[PDB]
């Protein structure tokens, strides 16, 4: 209470723009990326994205005095032209920690980008990245696992893990799909997996899918005699489905499933990372639907936001895009991120797009994937771009390979092997690059007759 | 088109797709780990050479990961020579041992490398 | 099988750009606005979108002769030109129902939206329209409840239902929340409800909220004579969390649940649904994160896809947007989602935005929610837009009226009861609107009151 | 409503015959084959079916105008007279989706066949065949596993399974029942199986069977190295028994189970059907009790609605019948139902009985099973008549063999394989038969003996 | 008896550093001590679960270990795995874990933890077959000064 | 690692008192009231009471090099005698948040007080007062209701 309640409208301004703040440790900070409409002065559109975002509505409501807004209040305490740009700007918005159920990104989310991407006064709006406080991350369990467990489980050391998503898309039996597996890892994959919508259908059932990839996997590691492992898809339509075959890959032994974490949502995968954690699984994430909402550069949510609300949430893994492949994304961005997802603490850098220095009391990292589009000819790209703690995948560039796929694998795992060594014995895999995998086509038969397929292919496009 | 056999091609993962490593070669690795300041150590086991699962199934359990550690990890070393030596001194002693040399980085604890040093005969 | 295995790349528009085809009952189709990249003639851009969807990836993969691909490709059938548009198109996409799980729109999703918005030789991909066949409509459970029975239950009959949202949004205690609670309700009102971001909270707990809530809708349910609701957040951070909110609404026999469907996630939501259905609870949608999607015309999700989605994965309330108030939404389109939400059968209608016959076998209908932003000075232009089955909820529009609750929710069922006289008179609520609040508001003094208060507040501004 | 109420009797036809009627694509249409009563004009006898069956009573009851019939009312669209028959028709009847249950047979039957076959105004009424539409087809979980998955996982293609039914029907010991399996195994049959009436008697109780059974398939498995099973009879009074046997088979590993689906009835074979689809176990479904229901041709309901009812239900395995051995069954009929247990798309074909084209929109499809009184000199036949995707049993035709069990097997197998081969040759195993086996009779010591013993057995009777 | 072990004191180790070991390392450091000839080695009593190292993640390398260890030296080893806990659940959640991976003790650091949840933890591992190790962590804080407290004696007498 | 492994006991002072160190904000902080054995430094004592309360033992073992003390050992920051008193003084001891299981006071105290009351080397010790960081707070659920609510 105090100062009369005063029925009526009043600019959001008035409380919500505060350029006088002091942030607070225990702050949830945001960058949001404003462009109001036409007679929107900034501080209203920002004002307003705060407000509607914590604790205000459109009118003065009696009811405010019944607690202290001062305390629970978001506040825009800075908006900052966006040089060289149509009138947009970068709103920043402080949240006190107060407003946020623990434990729980819905809430968060919810909160955040509930309502304010739809206001009349704006014509677009963006999320580009938000400041975590140690005070919320100590309350998520984060990943199952993380890094040096996974490493330290699969007993897998120096060089990026290697990965292939069995192919057709939909249509091939429980069966087909266990050999298609075998085929693959027997051949030098460390592990296979379904496709993002490969859950239960008519085609394929997912309890005979995973009962017979089982007996593959299980083949191809005894003949190998390296730990193998296939992401067994558990995303499905209700949780207690999700959870129900998550508990059968248990029963099986095997060691790692996978979720579409998007599709599926944050309350559901939140509850899987949970279970894997109990029951020692690897989960590997998958992120469907993202593009749908961290592409246009005016309006949405950016991927570091995403990628940092899985590390939350719980994923060993996540997929961080391959730069150089058949999907968007650029290069300094997705390094930016891609620390975001492995590092404990990351420092500030606009050049990388990291708005916001993030301290992540030691959450476990997350192994970034590369997949998509990628071949043989990538290797020593990916190889430099993202290091030995990533995970990188061949779909088409296996089951896409001349001989079949034991000998697509068997290409992979020797181009890789090759950028390796290079790089150990101080190749340059950047200016060097192309030699290296040139030179190792003409020892390796396998390696070779991949080399001659896609070496003409690259997927050059002016990025958005 | 030929058929990626089937039947003696065990692994031993880093490195194990290419050619025997030579000596010099071998020398690159000890040399990389120290370029970046991973404490060198050897492990070596005489009886399962590759992973099982006797005693337990449950997901991540595997029994054969855990291999002896030869001496200690060189803390302090800086010459990649010295632990060369050392697989040398093992393959006398344990001839058919399965050796390796592996780096830790202390500050994140991950084995940062690793690859096999020397297989016994036939392997 | 059958044609040798020929490894390599090859356009899509070789196998998913197929005009020839004649579109099955069963299939599953989709209407994309596509916009290429600079050199991609639709019709690549287009089967990329259908093969990246269904079946196919970037080069030549020998296991597709394993299965048939006549069968299961997904098939672009038809371009069609953006008159008067930077070429932009209208892919046309079909999708066999062998390829989908039952029951799941989390699978839905992942094959329709998967990945395919973020291709590199594209620019720009939404999502207009899905025309659902009644062989996967059967596949769901829908709205534990739909119109019909909610009314029945509730016993109301003949009018838009009311509701509030508390306000302020976050800061509120238990004990404040049902004193509220209680006010709004003994007025007139229907329902109040928890806002989307009210879940449990250092400020106030969920279990707390709870038990005060139903004190206060028991109290005002005795007092006015009539059936009473308080929307009771069950959106949590974990599915185990969801359920055991939702159980304690049971244990309390208080009416209704909501969640935030798009926060919360399909699977949980699906989860939830079959929970209300069982336990007799209706359920309350809130579309929270749904701008992030859908409001570019350019790229995402359309709402009435999200419309769709949900009345399949169940919802007795789903929020539809309100036209006339604080965020964007236009009439035609609205009153196209609208009837997608409550009709049996729904014919095809560019005019409104529905690109195909929309068939629900019989699957109940969601009764739309109009909130954000309205006054009683709006109240004959809802009604009209809208009519009987529909919810209007005031959050501001209560509190903020100057003599508390009670009489803002007193001055909300007038103003409403008024309408629905006009109306039923023959009053032409479009053109005579405006006289008939004001002539109310003349012989009531809480209808007054407010009047006065919000006369000249309008959210008028150029839409996109 | 509309039109008075006005109470009294009225004759079905004026709202239950409809020749006006154009069928809808998810309408149930039956083909009743009705019988009147002298004074009943067709078009009434098929309107009091399709009223007593869907939406009608004997009298006028104003609740009807509370509700549309239009839209619920079961309709007679035509009659047909019965060529070269003693007045009886096919009167055609549609019931709409709306009327039933999804996922329950239970809920169909009860419609369709719940009370108008005893109308006193007919005096014989036989279901031929009913369409289930796709949109109630996908409603059904289907056989827990289906041929393809059933031969994928036990891996055995290009040939009819072989099984026998150890005899005496009842008064066996666990023992000997062991002993008996273990023996007809070895011999290289793929299957023993309980009979239908061995459930749990004071003679030999089910646990002790399932333990013995399991001694013996795993030490003939072990023998051959062929993957062998036994079916163990699951069928018992309440179905919390049945379940629980279900539970032992699979704690013992064994791979399929069995169950007497008519005596047991659908609500506990769907049961039984989703635990194994969820466990695991292959079920093999046994029709005793179908001949009550469908030996007469003017009387009844058809095997092929049985047999469609089953599918639906879920079922691995079902008995088709043999044709040539001791129960009656003719070829025509035989072949039309199988094509509609294994086919994907069945066209209609009067020749062979099916009234309707059959769509099963991916259903997985049963494994039809021949037996009863079957002996190698039936082989050929039955080869012929079934094809590699059939069952084939050899109950008394095993333990019925001079030199016991094994040598029984072994016997049926040569013979079978022996068909298999000439059949693959290009010779005609319809003329060509009787060599075959004769020739085989020659080379094979035990199929020999048989040979002999069997040689001047038939069992043509003139069929009803 | 059930270790198989007479004549003379049983030998153990506690593994150092005291916190801050990762999963992996602690079994490498584990079987290391068992294979030289120690019966036992076991968790620091302020070893539950924390970021640096998680205790199902601790239990299953341990159990890799002492597995490797005694089959190499043919004698029945142990490690035991710490229990202590913040919540009753939590506390048997891990005793059963143990009990999944058929090692022979746990163990439980009853005065913090308390004498609630100790004797809850007696009874799971007498149920189950697992032998219980306490460590008196806090104790003295209340056995130290010779005028005020409780005697150890006592302390000992009350486990 | 880095330092050669170099068997044998060395004072705790070496690693443990450290009055060069800056808090961090999520630290766990202590105020323990030490009085020494007569011929035991204030600052002996004092890495005593954090070294045997955090990552360390009475000699030294390899197993250090593994990882990293300088993110895990507890560690004493500063001394002050207790103005009159008996050979009496205020250790403060800093233990970083990394050590702590999240929500269990049973861990917090198994580490703070466990081992140390118990010291040859002191001869009474006492915990006075724990600054306990946000970061940690917000692990606990901490009252069923409070104040507030009850009332
Ligand atoms: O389904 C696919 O298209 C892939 O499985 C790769 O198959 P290919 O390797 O044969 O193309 C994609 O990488 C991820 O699934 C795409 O996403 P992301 O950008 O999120 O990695
Ligand atoms: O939180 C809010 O702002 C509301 O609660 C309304 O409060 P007011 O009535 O006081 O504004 C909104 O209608 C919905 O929540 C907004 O979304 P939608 O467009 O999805 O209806
Ligand atoms: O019990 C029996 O008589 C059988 O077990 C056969 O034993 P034999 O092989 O010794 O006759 C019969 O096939 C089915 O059981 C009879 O029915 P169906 O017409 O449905 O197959
Ligand atoms: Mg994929
Ligand atoms: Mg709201
Ligand atoms: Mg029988
Ligand atoms: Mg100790």
Same mark, same amino acid.
């Given at each position: 209470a105090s100062v009369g309640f005063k029925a009526g409208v009043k600019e959001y301004k008035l409380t919500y723009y505060t350029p006088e703040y002091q942030t607070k440790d225990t702050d949830i900070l945001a960058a949001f990326r404003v462009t109001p409409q036409p007679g929107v002065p900034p501080e209203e559109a920002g004002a307003a994205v705060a407000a509607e975002s914590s604790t205000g509505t459109w009118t003065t409501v009696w009811t405010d005095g019944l607690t202290s807004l001062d305390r629970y209040k978001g506040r825009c305490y800075r908006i900052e032209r966006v040089v060289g740009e149509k009138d947009q700007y970068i709103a920043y918005v402080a949240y006190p920690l107060d407003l946020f159920?623990?434990?729980?990104?819905?809430?968060?989310?919810?909160?955040?980008?509930?309502?304010?991407?739809?206001?009349?006064?704006?014509?677009?709006?963006?999320?580009?990245?938000?400041?975590?406080?140690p005070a919320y991350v100590k309350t998520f369990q984060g990943p199952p696992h993380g890094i040096q467990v996974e490493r330290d489980k699969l007993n897998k050391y120096g060089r990026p893990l290697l990965g292939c998503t069995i192919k057709p898309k939909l249509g091939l039996s429980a069966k087909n799909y266990g050999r298609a597996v075998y085929e693959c890892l027997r051949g030098g994959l460390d592990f296979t997996k379904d496709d993002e919508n490969v859950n239960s259908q008519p085609f394929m059932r997912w309890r005979d899918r995973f009962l017979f990839c089982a007996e593959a996997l299980y083949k191809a590691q005894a003949e190998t005699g390296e730990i193998k492992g296939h992401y067994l898809n558990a995303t499905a339509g209700t949780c207690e489905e999700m959870i129900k075959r998550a508990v059968f890959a248990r029963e099986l032994g095997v060691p790692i499933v996978m979720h579409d974490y998007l599709t599926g949502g944050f309350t559901a995968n939140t509850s899987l990372a949970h279970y894997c954690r109990d029951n020692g699984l690897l989960l590997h994430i998958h992120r469907a639907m993202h593009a749908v909402i961290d592409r246009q550069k005016n309006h949405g949510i950016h991927f570091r936001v995403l990628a940092k609300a899985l590390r939350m949430s719980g994923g060993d893994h996540i997929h961080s895009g391959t730069v150089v492949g058949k999907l968007e994304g650029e290069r300094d961005i997705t390094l930016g991120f891609v620390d975001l997802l492995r590092d404990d603490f990351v420092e500030q850098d606009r050049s990388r797009g990291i708005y916001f220095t993030q301290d992540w009391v030691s959450l476990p990292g997350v192994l970034p994937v590369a997949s998509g589009g990628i071949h043989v000819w990538h290797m020593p790209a990916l190889t430099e771009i993202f290091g030995d703690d990533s995970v990188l995948q061949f779909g088409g560039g296996t089951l896409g390979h001349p001989w079949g796929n034991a000998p697509g694998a068997?290409?992979?795992?020797?181009?890789?092997?090759?950028?390796?060594?290079?790089?150990?014995?101080?190749?340059?895999?950047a200016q060097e690059g192309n030699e290296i995998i040139r030179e190792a086509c003409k020892w390796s038969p396998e390696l070779a007759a991949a080399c001659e397929v896609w070496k003409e292919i690259v997927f050059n496009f002016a990025a958005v | 088109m030929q058929v990626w056999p089937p039947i003696n091609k065990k692994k031993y993962e880093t490195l194990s797709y290419l050619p025997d490593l030579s000596q010099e070669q071998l020398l690159?690795?000890?040399?990389?780990?120290?370029?970046?300041?991973?404490?060198?150590?050897?492990?070596?086991?005489?009886?399962?050479?590759? #992973?099982?699962?006797?005693?337990?199934? *449950?997901?991540?359990? @595997?029994?054969?990961?855990?291999?002896?550690?030869?001496?200690?990890?060189?803390?302090?070393?800086?010459?990649?020579?010295?632990?060369?030596?050392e697989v040398g001194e093992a393959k006398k002693a344990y001839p058919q041992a399965w050796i390796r040399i592996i780096?830790?980085?202390? #500050?994140?604890?991950?084995?940062?490398? *690793?690859?096999?040093? @020397?297989?016994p005969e036939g392997y």
């Open positions: 159920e623990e434990g729980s990104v819905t809430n968060m989310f919810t909160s955040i980008v509930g309502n304010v991407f739809g206001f009349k006064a704006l014509r677009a709006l963006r999320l580009e990245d938000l400041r975590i406080p068997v290409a992979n795992r020797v181009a890789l092997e090759a950028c390796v060594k290079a790089r150990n014995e101080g190749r340059d895999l | 690159s690795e000890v040399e990389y780990l120290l370029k970046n300041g991973w404490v060198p150590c050897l492990e070596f086991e005489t009886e399962h050479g590759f #992973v099982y699962r006797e005693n337990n199934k *449950s997901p991540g359990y @595997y029994d054969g990961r855990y291999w002896t550690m030869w001496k200690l990890p060189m803390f302090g070393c800086t010459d990649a020579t010295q632990v060369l030596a780096g830790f980085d202390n #500050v994140r604890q991950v084995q940062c490398i *690793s690859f096999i040093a @020397y297989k």
